[PDB]
Structure formats: C-alpha cells, structure tokens
Design a binder for this molecule. Sequence first.
Ligand SMILES: Cc1cc2nc3c(=O)[nH]c(=O)nc-3n(C[C@H](O)[C@H](O)[C@H](O)COP(=O)(O)O)c2cc1C
Ligand SMILES: O=c1cc(-c2ccc(O)cc2)oc2cc(O)cc(O)c12
Length: 288
Amino acid sequence: MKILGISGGMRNGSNDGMCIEALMGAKEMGAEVEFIQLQNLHIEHCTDDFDWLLDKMLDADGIVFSTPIFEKGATGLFHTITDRFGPRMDRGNNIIGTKIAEETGGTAPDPRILKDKVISFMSVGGSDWVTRTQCDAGMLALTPMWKVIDNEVFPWALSILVEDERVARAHQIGRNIAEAAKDIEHAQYQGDAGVCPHCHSRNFHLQDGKAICCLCGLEGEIHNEGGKYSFTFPAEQLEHAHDTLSGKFIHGNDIKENTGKKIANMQTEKYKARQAAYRAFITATVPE
Ligand SMILES: Cc1cc2nc3c(=O)[nH]c(=O)nc-3n(C[C@H](O)[C@H](O)[C@H](O)COP(=O)(O)O)c2cc1C
Ligand SMILES: O=c1cc(-c2ccc(O)cc2)oc2cc(O)cc(O)c12
C-alpha cells in the first residue's frame, strides 16, 4: 500500500516533521511512502498545480495531511483545496456522472475518482486557538467521503519536534493510516469519539429548537448532563447527513432544481432590469 503525506507548513517546519514522522510509522507497517510539500505547489483560488496534486492523491491508498492552524482553523490554502475538490471529487456527482456516461455512450470518467480511500489529519497550532480546525479537516474528506482514521489537534506546538511523546503520537497516526489502508473496507475510525455520534464532531450551530452538527449536518439537540454534552437526533435524519450517499443525492437534486429556477429567473424582466440598474449605479475599482 502507498501512503501519501502532505504538509501545509513552511518548508522544514513542524508540520513537515509531524507528517514525515507519520510516514515513518507507515513504512514501519510496510507501506510505500511519498511526501508533498504544498509550499512548492502553485494553487489558485476557486473562482494550477492542483490537478497534479489531485492526481497524486488518487493513486494513494491512504493520505496523511498535516496543516498549520490559522485563526483557529486550517490555512486559507487548505480551504482553497477544499473548494477545489467540489467540482471533481464529490462522490455523489461522480457516481451519477459515471452512470450517465455508461448509459449515453459517454466516456467513462477516471475510475480512481470512485475508489474508497482513507485519510488522516493533524492540525498543529502555536497556542490553544484551535477550536475550528478539526471540522475544517473533516470538510475535505466529506466531499469524496474518504474514511477518516485520525483527525488530531496539537495546540502549543511551536516546539513540538522536541516533545517526544507528541512526536510519537504522530508516529502512531502513521501506523494507523497504513494498517487502515491494508483493508480499506474494514478500517475503522481511531480518533476522538466527540459529541456527534455520527460526525464525531464537537462543533455545533445552535438556535432555538435546533442544534446542527457543523461537519455532518444532522439537526438534533444538544444535552448538558452535569457539564457533559451529547447530541441526539431523529433517525430519519441519517437519510440527509452530508457524508452519506443518500444525503448527497438529496443535496445534489435540490441544486439542480434551484439552478433551473435561477436560469429561468434570469430571463425575466425583473431580473434583467434590476441587473441593468446595478451596472448603471457603480463600476468596480481596480488597481491600475
Ligand atoms: C496568520 C497566522 C495565524 C495563526 N493562527 C493560529 C491560531 O489561531 N491558533 C494557533 O495555535 N496557532 C496559530 N498560528 C501559528 C501556526 O499554527 C504555526 O506557526 C504553525 O503551526 C507553524 O508550522 P510550520 O512549522 O509547519 O510552519 C498562526 C500563524 C499564522 C502565521
Ligand atoms: O507564531 C505565531 C505567529 C503569529 C503571527 C502572525 C502574524 C503576525 O504579524 C504576528 C504573529 O500568530 C500566532 C498566533 C497563535 O495563536 C499562535 C502562534 O504561534 C502564532
């Protein structure tokens, strides 16, 4: 099995070391290993080296991804790579687009795109402003539905490479990801159990009568039993979870419906007139 490790830090920084230490654990379990430093890549925002990167991810059986924490989440570059997964890696649309290709004599999209795959994440921050990065990491695996094995957070980690026990945790994440790639089907999540019995997430959006898992998006309720929190929801909701084929199909169907309504609305006079007034009112300032 091939384990691919990706670092989002500075060249030769702590994320490099944590991600390389994990590759070592993966080689210890008999995996072939490869390492990509994102600072060498040119990746444009979602309106260039991206297709190369995605191609490498497709050939790997498992991936370890180490990102720095910026403002209690992953880097803008991580977010960009998440943005740029949608058009290409959504398990839903690729199942659909494959079927349609078969049934209309289309050409069969890249098979690797639909292969099950395992992925692990480590978030390395310099202080404890780290409340959002795990959920960021999950988001990236949610679009292709890659089975997440570990999704660890490492606060107060400026000097982590001389803290042997945390370096060792990263070696164990390397182990886990290789063992899991040995049998992607029966691989099982190894990380924190968290609060969402489904997502494992600990991030929730809270309004009156509705708590929503920020990762998987079940709407449910959050219960405080003497300072311990838990998340319950109605078993209908599993049908809609954003990390299930069922919920993706629902989500994609509603997108196609509302994109048709949009295309029709853009031919009304209401739309055209309102747009024509906006252009008349003001023009965008650009740098000379
Ligand atoms: C713009 C910026 C924002 C950051 N925000 C956070 C943060 O919110 N919480 C945190 O622990 N660390 C934060 N850090 C520190 C980084 O996580 C740290 O520099 C990084 O893990 C270094 O990794 P490297 O050695 O791989 O480059 C931030 C750093 C920068 C440059
Ligand atoms: O090492 C750090 C560097 C920075 C940073 C980023 C930009 C600046 O002008 C000054 C500091 O923010 C941080 C925020 C944190 O929560 C933790 C850090 O280690 C850092």
